[PDB]
Every structure is written in structure tokens, then in C-alpha cells.
Symmetry: D2
Subunit: 337 residues, 4 copies
């Protein structure tokens, strides 16, 4: 089978033939139809995160395809089921986190396409209990990104705890923001899109966003004041010092600021105002199998559609390239068939 | 009527005769029997907060006493009712915050002994709807610190989400700290007291604290760890960057780190861990009229007692010196009879 | 001023001149532009409920209109503010219910057009803290059913716990039913409309409802099995024994069955299944001042429109006649100008 | 090995030597040290519940003992661990219920000592992922009842949603009731014990209960009114027509009635009053693995202790004799060593 191996950090990826994995108990082998690409893959190749991966490594925590074989004793999935292998490759199922509904946080979790081989290959071995069925009415192309940025974003929106009728501010109408907006709408919310790019605010608006501001150009929080009483919550999709300061100020008292990005730097946050106004700052990323079942169904119903550009496995290095100069419109799925 | 009065900032106050206030509609006239003192009264005195008070000012948002006359309109209180006047002097009662359970954040709120004359005097004019009744079984001197330290700490504990069985770390065993521990135990929780004085830790243990550490010499997070598996939550009662930092690291994944102090500067949270481990950082101060009633009732049942020292009004300045010098263990309550 | 007046029970009401009421401290005087009618106004008329009203009485708790004078004390309202007088005429605003978010349950509540004169007259005296403002963008005739049907149904939907994506069954597509469906949709929900008239089911479908059943020629519970896997919840808007048993059986395990009707008799629940499957049976009526504000805002944004028929005061008895005969489709709103 | 086999319904159980079971993948073999008996077991003998068991059957869903062998692939349990096999023998792990945290409700669940052999034998095959470790500081004797009576009751208490400070009424200080009281105390609550026998009301008070009342002698609901203000919730441990009516009436408006009984009959509830007071009626039984770990730990800390009478396997039929007569005080554990 063919794959895209990261042999050495920061080095271009090899598109070589590799040994096609074997499967023992409780596993499935999956023939990969597509696999979405996001910044996380790139950081895996560059090797520049506290915990770094084991080389060589096939990336892809957004791989989706067909269950080709089912190892001894797996019963809840049949050959030929349409299926996806999300970031949470496996978790213990036994610790407290797992028994709460926070398997996403399990200390002994293995991560797809980072600590084990993932979706940048023709085939992928997966943990049967931990793969998720893609519903019929939803294409492989479309589903792939629902596995990262869909759930990440959807779950974030559940986490804001904003309820139908209330207002969320989405910060950054890129690959997260652009799908956030649709989820927030499908979730009963009124949206404020916030972005430096006048064309992204245009997109967000076709996408359902109720109000746009461009935080240049004028004052974003003073506009959300202003206007809508200040938003109930904000989702930050490109967390940076000024992105956060904005979200923070625009949120009404008691509001939540949910941070979904993964930047290297430490913040800071005002303590006085946070205490005086009981502001909530919360990290969230990916989400539960159930979160994903739920996020996938919204897409399955037309309520959210991702802006994809298809590419083949071999153009991967060009796509990281591109990604690193920040020239990617939403998300890049890789075709394998 | 005599009062402690703030004439100029950073200047000794003047115990002196002033005008005994007149009452209008929905107001009551309270004869102060005792008033609590905390750092907040002092920051008023020094006038060093972003929104400074207007001089002259009688401080005290921890005053309790007897209702001497009802204003017209008020029908829910009678002459002789033992009552208190919280930091939350008044709220509009109509804004959205007021119709959630969030009067504490009302944009129109007035603050006792800050934006209006408070409890450092023989009498106080108060908004009837906003006074909280003291249970019969609890004395004036005991009740008074429950009006700030009690509610603030109790509320903080509720906001943590922590359920009977779970673990909290209380950071700093001072005025808030030592009452925080008692509320924690009364609420089903298991407690790790954390402080730099081994004396405070000894006091914590007396108050029910399950486990102590001091933090210089190890290392709280890792003790805590090691050990209870990391606490479900932390309440930080004196926020220095090192306290908040340890608080942050001791908290297990999914955990809530409730901030309760009001220091001037900003403190930096590491975005990457905050997102990855689903951390919550939350500000909280004081509480609802109902929060307070609940806070008060635990004390009535003898499940939390404050460490009070009683000084007469005339000694207020002497007490601010010992405050600046950091010498007050527990809480000082002013007497007025 | 003129009014429809209940002089003796079960007798036709007399349209006649009466005293235009005078206002004291904290009240306002509203000039009624329109007032909704519901079964509850008729149960007052017939005096057949456990706690009967004192005669003579002006019914109507869906009265909306212009504020014509502000009582002394009231500061949050001005003359010409378009306002409504909900069933919750007033509460003590001090008890525990009132300081949760449960004013709806206050032991001292007074009810509009039941314990005190209400909306069936040119003027009405109301408790200022308790009138709810009507959005600018919404007319009197539309607003008025939102003051009973809207909140009761919207709240009811919230109380079910059902989150965006999940399924509810709205049982009975009448005055409540047809507004329930619209709220349900605006709230992110998927809706199974259930009624005996195939006509109502067509109406439901126009209103946004995803699936209908009759039951009553199919099995409804089994339809819902089947289908959607059983609904997360049911709001039962006309509680007859059969509707309840059907509702109860259609709900999936863990489910909530929210009751909203007020029939005289008792309905039996199967203790053994209720425990085994963790079912919840919950009563809900009307809602908070804040509940209504939210209910009202959905209508302002055009997401729920009530089907109204307008009649002048003089035609009231003709409308109670059509009410008993069960002929009123949707809601009737009385005009007074 | 020897077991207590239900060969024919209602017929006395045969203590007979039977085939020691074998274990495959994902399973464990357990040597039973003890096994609690309760009403459920008896209803498996008598065969008188909607879904009846397959015969022969070895009852016991409170069996606790030692992991004698681990089947291929299990990794969390190790040979020699102390362990228990609760009512929920197994569930699918993949349906919605399972992924909410409602495995208790899974349509595909097997039940121990009912739909498969459980604890009334010397040995018991079990689903590795579904057994729970008994904490070290807790005897097999003490733990056995925590596996059914403990959780059912602990969980019930979480479900009431009552919080530290509030009041719950435990109805029936028998087998469940007597441990409920301790749990509610441990959970921060204030308890009202309600029982016909002064016997039990004395026991309850030793066990921590704040107030008692015999529904003889006098009005239970009016006493609770009265007094405490009406309880926030009631757990009903012996559901009967008049028990339930009492709990119902004593609950304050907004309160919850958690039913924990398994009586054969239907049971009227008032609809009018339920709606008007937003009352909640909720079935609950057993609970999650995590619910059970938590319930076990309270006992481990000496916060709840079960009143046990030990008996060997042979007197099992003597125990059902007394039980059907209702002369058992607390719970009967069977010894197997
Ligand atoms: Zn990704
Ligand atoms: Zn785990
Ligand atoms: Zn204070
Ligand atoms: Zn306000
Ligand atoms: Zn009505
Ligand atoms: Zn009240
Ligand atoms: Zn049992
Ligand atoms: Zn299941």
C-alpha cells in the first residue's frame, strides 16, 4: 500500500510504498477514500509541539473510507460500512474521564495520525470501538472535515452553553469559523461573524451569519455592545493576543469565551474584570464519539456544508505550503481512489 | 450620628459626627449593630481602583443591624428585623442580568460603602428589597463576615461545579480561605488546603481540611497529583501569579479554576494546555440575595464559623495599618454600640 | 370605562360601564388595545376550578396595550410604552421561589383576570414590576397570544431538556399545539406533530413540523418507534387519558414527558416502567417574566406567528359558545379600540 | 461448583452441584465471596414480571468476590482483584444510551442473576468491562449491598437534583431507606425520614436523619410544611398508593419525586396540581459504573454502612420465606467461603 510518510521532521514527505497493516482483536482495517488535512497534521510533520510524534508517521486524523476487514470479536460494525477514524484513535474506556463522558481527555488515549498511523495512506488500522459511522446521505468528501473542525466547532458551541435565541460571536471565519457559523445557526443561535477580511464577512453572511463586523475599522466589541447588548458567548478560532482581547470585551457579563485554537504562546487575561464580571474562559477541542455522531447528522441534513478543495495524496507537500503562508480557503480534503 | 468617614484618599479616616440619613420610598433605616471589614473597604479608602468612589464616603458593605423604620411601600420587613446590607446595595431588577439569577452583575447596581454610604456608622439607609435577613440563631458579629467572605466563598464553591465526593483545593487560608474550607466540607467536598504558613495549614486541618500542602517545599500540583489524582477544582483566594499557576496545574483535566481575589495586574494562561485539557477559568465574587441566604443558613446550623476579632469604630485606622502590614488572621468586625 | 364582566358563574357575561380604576404606588394604568382569550378565561367564567374567583370579575390575562399613567415609585416604564399583563399579575419577589427563577410559583401570587381584574376592558391596573414590554417590531394582536400560548409552550419546550437535533412530539395541534411546533423548530428541534384531525396535521406540516401521525388509525408510539427511534420528549397540550398514554409510550427511555393542559381528573402512570426506564413526568405552565421576553422575541423575529381571529368585546359570549363547541381554530383576540 | 438454581418458578430453589462456567474473550471468572439478596432476586424465583427469566437460573446481581482468571484480551482487571458483578451485566457500549452515560438503559443489556447466571453460586462468569473494583478498605460483606441498594439510592439522590443545604424526604426507612439517609447526609443534605414504625424512625435518627414523622400520628405533609417549608425532593423506597400521595404532597412547588420502587400497579397522579406547581416525577433505579464507583467510595470512607445479616447459601429459601413475609431488617448477604 501507498502512504505519505513523515520520515524526518520539517523534511518534505515521502510518498513511498509501505507495508499494509495487519489487524488482531477489536480492530478494523479501513480502505481510505478521503482524508482531510488541517494545521494539526502540519505540526505533526514539523515536530514542534511539547509531546512530539514517533517517526516514521502517516498523518491523518480525518481519514474516512470503507471497513474492508473486521478482526476477531468486533460485532457492532460490518464489512463495507462507511466509517471514519477521528483524532481520538483509542482511549481506555475505564478511567474516570471515560466514564464521565470525557473520553476526549483520557490520559491513555492514542491519537490517529500522530501517535499512530492515520489517514494519509490507502489503508488504516483502527480501533473498532472508536471509529464512527458516516451516515449514508453524506459524501466521503464532505464528511472528512466534520471529523475535525465540524465537531471541534460544534462541541465548542455546546460548551458556550448559549441557548436558542441567544447571540454568539464567532472570531475567524476560516476553516473553523466558516463551519461554526452554520452550526450556531442550526443550533438556534444568532451569530456575529468577526473577521479582518471583508470577503470572509461576505461568506459568513451567505452562510447565515446575522451581523458582521471587521474589527479594524471599527471597534468590534463596541459594535456588539451596541446593537445586541453584547454577545452571550464567543468562539475564537484563530486565538491570538488581539483576537482574544476582542472576544473577551464583546462578551456580556457572565458570558463564556471558548478558545478552540492551538497557538504556542501564553495569553494573558485580566483578573480583576474577570472576577468582577464572572467571565468564563474555557478550552475545547474535538469531542466525544457522541458529539461527532451529532455533528455528522447536522451535515447529513444540509444544515452545515464544508468548503472543500480536493487534492491527491501526492500534492500533500504543496498543500502544507500554502497552509504555512495561510492561503487555504476553508479545508483541503485528499482523495485516494 | 457618628461615622468613620473617608475625606481624602490614602489619608487617615475621621471618626466624627455627620448627618443621620433620611429615608424615602422602598428604603429602610438600619441601626448598625456591627460591620465587617475587608481589603475591599481599604481599597476604597486608598481610592486606588479603576472606578474610584466619590468623597466623602462612609465605607462598609458588611454592616448588619436592626431595622429602625420602614419606608413607604415596603411591606416585607418590620421594625426590629435583624438585617444586613450587602455589597450589592441595589440593582434595577429589570435588566436581563436581573431576570437570570445574576443581579450581582446588573449595570445599574449601586455598591454599599462604595458608591453609597455603608456600614461604618451608627445608622445606614438601605434599599429594602436588597437587605438580607439574618437568621435568629446567628449573632451580629458572626453574621457580618458571612456577608462577604461567606457568600463569596460559598458561591465560588458552587460555581466550581464540584459534587459531593469530589476534591477542591482552596488556595490561601486567610479571611476567605478558612471560611472557604468550612463551606467546602459542609457541601460534601474533600479539601486540599494550600498555603505558605504551616500555621494556616494547621488551622485548615482544624476546620475539616482533608489534606494540606505548602508549596514551597514541594510543589502543590504534584503533591496533588500524586495523591488524589488531581483535584476536580480550585478556589484561589489570593491571586498572585504563582498561586494561580499552581492552582492551574493541580486541577485535573476538565477542571475548573475559580478566581476570587481582585489583584490589579493581568496573569497569563497557557492557551495550548487550556484548550487541550479542557480547562475552565472563572471569576466570581459575592453572590445573589439567595446565594447569601443559603450562605447564612449554613452558619446558622453551626457548619461554618468565622474567626472574628472585635474592635470599636474608633480603632478603624489601626486596623487598616495591621491590614496593610498583613497581620489580621481571619476577620475584624467593627462594633458600634 | 367599559368591560366584559363576570357577574354570576355560568351566566352570560355583561358588557357594561364600570369604574375606570385608580392607581397607587408601584402600579401602572394600561389602556388595553387587545386581549387574548383562552380556555382559562372560560374556566374562570364558569367558576368550575378548585380555587374559584371572587365575583364580579373582569377576565383576561393576555391583555396588551399602551401605558397611560405611571404610578409613584415606578422608574423603569414610561407613558406610551407598549406593554402586557401576564397571568402572573404579581409575586412577593422575596420568597425562595422568587429568588430562584420561579416567580411563577410564588405562594403570594395574584393572577390577572382571575384573582384581580384583567384584560377584558378598556383599561386595566397592573403591577409595574410585573408588566412585560412588547417588542417594537410586533403588533398588539400578534403579541397577545404569546402572553399565554407562547410562553407556556416555549417554556414547556425548554423544560423538556431537548437540545438542537433531538426530537419532540407535540401532542395536539390547537391553540397551544400550533405555536408549540413553531417554537420547537426555532429551537433547533425536530418535531413529530400528533393529532386526530388530518387537517391539523396539514397545518403542522406548513408550520415546520417534520413528521405527522393521526394517531388514531396508526399507532403513534409505534410510528415514532420506528422511524425516529422514539422521541426525546413530548409536550402534551391537551391532556386526555389516551393522549398521555400515547405520549408516555412514544418517548424513548430517559425521556421527558412535559404536561401543559389542566384537566380535572387524575391520570395513572405505570410505576414499574417509569422506574425501569427512568421516565420523567413534569408539569409546566406559563413562565417567568424572562421566559416571556424570550418567547416574545422569537415572534418579533418572525419565527413564530399565531393564527388569530379578531372580535370586539361585545362578541365575547359568542366566542365562549364557539369555544365550548370546540370550533375555534388557533386563537381568538379581542379588539377594544 | 455449587449454586442455588431456580429450576421451576415459585418452587423452592435447589442447592445443587453445577457445571463451573468457562470464559472466552473480554470476560472474567470470579470466585464469589458474598452475594446480597433483595426483592429483585425473589421476583426472579416467582417469575412474575413482564419479561420473565430463562430457566434454570442462578440469581444474584450483588455478587462480590475475586478475579480468579482473566479471559484473552482484558487488561484493566488483574487476577486477584476484588470485584463485583452488578445488575447491569453488560450493555452494547455503542448505542446512544451507552454514549450519553445512560448504559443503565441500553436495549441490548444483559442482566446478572436474571437473564444470565449471577452470584448465588461459588463461581460467576462476567463481562470484564462491566464489573467494578471494590475499594480496598471495604469488606466483601459491606460492599455486596452497595451494588444495588447503595447505588439505586445514591443515584436516586443525584437525580432529585437537591443540593447541599436543601431538604429531602426519604420515604420508607427499610432496606433502601436506611442507606439513603446516610447518602443524603453525606451529600450535604438535610433529611426528613418518613415511616409507619417508630422502630425505623429511631434508627433513621441514629443514622443522621434531621427530623422524623410517622404518617399515623399525624399529617406528614403538613408536618413537613410546617417546620422546614416543604421538602425540595422525596425519594420513595416503598412505592404504594398512599406512600406516593404523601411524598407528592410534602414536596414544595417545583420539587421532585423520585420513585425507586418496583410495584406491579398503576398509580394516579394529579394532573392539574402537577402542572400548576411544575412538579417532577421521575423513575430511577440502579445506575452507572461511575455512579457505583462513587457510591462504593462513600462507604469506603465510612460515610454509609449497611445493616447486614449474614447467611449461607443453603438458607436462601428460608430468606425468601421471611422476605415475602417482610421480616427482614435492612439486607441479607449470603456468605460463600
Ligand atoms: Zn484536523
Ligand atoms: Zn480513559
Ligand atoms: Zn468585604
Ligand atoms: Zn438590573
Ligand atoms: Zn390564556
Ligand atoms: Zn414570592
Ligand atoms: Zn438487588
Ligand atoms: Zn447500549
Amino acid at each position: 500500500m501507498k502512504a505519505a510518510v513523515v520520515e524526518q521532521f520539517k523534511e518534505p514527505l515521502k510518498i513511498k510504498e509501505v507495508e499494509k497493516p495487519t489487524i488482531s482483536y477489536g480492530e478494523v482495517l479501513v480502505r481510505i477514500k478521503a482524508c482531510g488535512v488541517c494545521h494539526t497534521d502540519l505540526h505533526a510533520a514539523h515536530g514542534d509541539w511539547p509531546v512530539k510524534p514517533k517517526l516514521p508517521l502517516i498523518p491523518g486524523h480525518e481519514g474516512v473510507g470503507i471497513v474492508e476487514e473486521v478482526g476477531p470479536g468486533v460485532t457492532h460494525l460490518k464489512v463495507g460500512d462507511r466509517v471514519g477514524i477521528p483524532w481520538l484513535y483509542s482511549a481506555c474506556g475505564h478511567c474516570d474521564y471515560c466514564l464521565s463522558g470525557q473520553e476526549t481527555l483520557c490520559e491513555h488515549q492514542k491519537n490517529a495520525g500522530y501517535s499512530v498511523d492515520g489517514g494519509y495512506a490507502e489503508y488504516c488500522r483502527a480501533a473498532a470501538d472508536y471509529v464512527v459511522k458516516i451516515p449514508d446521505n453524506l459524501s466521503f468528501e464532505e464528511a472528512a472535515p466534520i471529523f475535525c473542525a465540524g465537531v471541534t466547532t460544534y462541541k465548542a458551541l455546546k460548551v458556550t452553553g448559549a441557548k436558542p435565541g441567544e447571540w454568539v460571536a464567532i472570531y475567524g471565519i476560516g476553516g473553523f469559523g466558516h463551519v461554526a457559523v452554520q452550526y450556531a445557526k442550526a443550533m438556534g443561535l444568532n451569530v456575529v461573524a468577526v473577521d479582518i477580511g471583508d470577503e470572509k464577512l461576505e461568506l459568513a453572511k451567505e452562510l447565515g451569519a446575522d451581523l458582521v463586523v471587521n474589527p479594524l475599522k471599527e471597534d468590534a466589541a463596541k459594535f456588539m455592545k451596541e446593537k445586541v447588548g453584547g454577545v452571550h458567548a464567543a468562539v475564537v478560532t484563530a486565538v491570538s493576543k488581539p483576537a482574544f482581547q476582542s472576544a473577551y470585551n464583546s462578551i456580556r457579563r457572565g458570558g463564556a469565551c471558548v478558545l478552540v485554537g492551538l497557538p504556542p504562546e501564553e495569553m494573558p487575561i485580566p483578573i480583576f474584570d474577570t472576577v468582577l464580571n464572572g467571565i468564563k474562559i474555557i478550552g475545547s477541542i474535538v469531542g466525544t464519539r457522541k458529539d461527532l455522531q451529532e455533528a455528522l447528522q447536522f451535515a447529513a441534513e444540509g444544515k452545515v456544508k464544508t468548503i472543500i478543495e480536493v487534492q491527491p495524496l501526492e500534492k500533500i507537500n504543496e498543500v502544507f505550503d500554502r497552509m504555512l503562508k495561510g492561503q487555504i480557503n476553508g479545508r483541503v480534503v485528499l482523495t485516494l481512489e
